Structures are given as C-alpha cells and as structure tokens.
Design a protein around this ligand. Structure first.
Ligand SMILES: COc1cccc(N2C=Cc3cc(S(N)(=O)=O)sc3S2(=O)=O)c1
Ligand SMILES: [Hg+2]
Ligand SMILES: [Zn+2]
Length: 257
C-alpha cells in the first residue's frame, strides 16, 4: 500500500494512518541554536559486543539486517533512557542523490543517508508490546556523509546483490554493528515516532551529532536495490525517506554544549 511514490508517498499516509498528523511525529529538523544542552543527561551505553545478526532482507521499503533479540545480546542504555533497550534490527534511508536521504536534518541540512538501529524497551516483554508504549522504542540515528569508505559497511554492501528484489533475504550472520558507530557518542534527543507507517509514537530518538562517512560506491550499491518484487517492473529503491515534521510541543535536548 504505502510507499514513496507520488501516488502513495508520505503525503498520502494520513488517509490510512491518521497518526501521521499527530503530536510527536518524526523525523524533525534539528535546530542547533535552540536545542537545549541538558547537563543531567547521562552518556549513552551501547553494548553491541555480543550482538548476533541473522538475516538481511529487502522488504520493498528498505533492506533490514535483523538480530537475535531473545536475550540481552546487544543493548542500549544510559542517555535519556531508563531501562534496557534491545537491538532487533537496523536499516537505512537514502536518496537518489548525495544531497538527500537522511530523514532528520540538522539546521535544515540533509545527509546522504541515515542509519537507524532499532531497539525496544525490554520492560515490555516483546517487541509487539513495546510498540504500544510511549517509551517502547529507542532508535539510534546516525547520519552518513559521502567521503571515505566505511570498512564495517562493506560486508553489507557485498550481499546486496542477493537481495535485489522485494521479498528476498539472505543469511547474514556474525556481523558486528560496532563498525557502524562514529567515534563520539554525543547526541540530540527528543520524543518522536516511526518514520514509516504505522507511524507509531513510541520512539525516543537519539540522533548522534557525529556522522560516519561512506564512499560514493558504497552508497551507490544501495541505489541498485529494487522496491518491486522479482518478475514485476523494476523500481529503483531510492529516496525512501520522510520529510521533516513540525516539532510542535517538543524540545530537543543536547547531551553536549
Ligand atoms: C506494530 O508496528 C510494527 C511492527 C513490526 C515492525 C514495525 N516496524 C515498522 C516500521 C519502522 C520504521 C522504523 S524507523 N524508520 O522509524 O526507524 S523502525 C520500524 S519497525 O519497528 O521495524 C512496526
Ligand atoms: Hg506507542
Ligand atoms: Zn528508519
């Protein structure tokens, strides 16, 4: 149903998902001058050393690397969070050109792509319960800029050939998500939602200020993915991002000054 085309893109979402015009929708523009430094903000605790990746699959919207979240293998704690959040999957949003692709912007600036490491609040038992809570999910957002190649990203880039079309999946075990992290864990944080339908407002967004760079050839491989399934007319998977939403009654807190 929903997609990123003129006929079923972000502008049409509200018809099937009314929360699209809700009070805490993401992504948002991060205005750095009016964001508030908060000294009571704890540092992030990202423990991804016991992470266990399982699959990589094209879902017609993006490609997702899924992880085993049956136990606290890769968790997120600290920062503005209270409780442990488990990594269940990560995905990217990218554009058809280097000047677009990220969902969140910084002072209106768009990056080439954006990585979202999705975590769910373990106090809720399972992911399905978590998406029914205002503090059910924590998504770590990381910006990707085009520059030098990101070593930890190549393994993902290589397997894209086997998951070109919608519905395809491939085994993708022993992948270390720590290769996708910037050097600094400084961040901005605000209450928001999923950036794609069902557009649920259960997310505490933690967007890192430091982006990671990837070569144009690495992000180039992203653009050869297909929205369509095999045997269907080809649709390049590009621009799978949602425009910034009004901040409304919200303030973005910074962990740095
Ligand atoms: C009942 O809601 C469900 C159930 C199962 C999966 C999802 N998901 C859908 C979209 C979606 C978009 C995300 S983003 N771009 O904001 O980080 S994270 C995410 S999801 O958790 O994978 C929602
Ligand atoms: Hg929710
Ligand atoms: Zn996303």
């Amino acid at each position: 149903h929903w997609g990123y085309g003129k006929h079923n893109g972000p502008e049409h979402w509200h018809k099937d998902f009314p929360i699209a015009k809700g009070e805490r929708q993401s992504p948002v523009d991060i205005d750095t001058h009016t964001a508030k430094y908060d000294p009571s903000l704890k540092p992030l605790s990202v423990s991804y050393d016991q992470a266990t990746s399982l699959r990589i699959l094209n879902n017609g919207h993006a490609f997702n690397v899924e992880f085993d979240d049956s136990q606290d293998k890769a968790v997120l704690k600290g920062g503005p969070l209270d409780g442990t959040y488990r990594l269940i999957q990560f995905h990217f949003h990218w554009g058809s050109l280097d000047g677009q692709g990220s969902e969140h912007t910084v002072d209106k600036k768009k990056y080439a792509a954006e990585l979202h490491l999705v975590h769910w609040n373990t106090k809720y038992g399972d992911f399905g319960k978590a998406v029914q809570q205002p503090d059910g999910l924590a998504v770590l957002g990381i910006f990707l800029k085009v520059g030098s190649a990101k070593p930890g990203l190549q393994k993902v880039v290589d397997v894209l050939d086997s998951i070109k079309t919608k519905g395809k999946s491939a085994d993708f075990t022993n992948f270390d998500p720590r290769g996708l992290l910037p050097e600094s864990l400084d961040y901005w944080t605000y209450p928001g939602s999923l950036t794609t339908p069902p557009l649920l407002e259960c997310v505490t967004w933690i967007v890192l200020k430091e982006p990671i760079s990837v070569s144009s050839e690495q992000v180039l491989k992203f653009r050869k993915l297909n929205f369509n399934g095999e045997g269907e007319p080809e649709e390049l998977m590009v621009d799978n991002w949602r425009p910034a939403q009004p901040l409304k009654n919200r303030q973005i807190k910074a962990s740095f000054k």
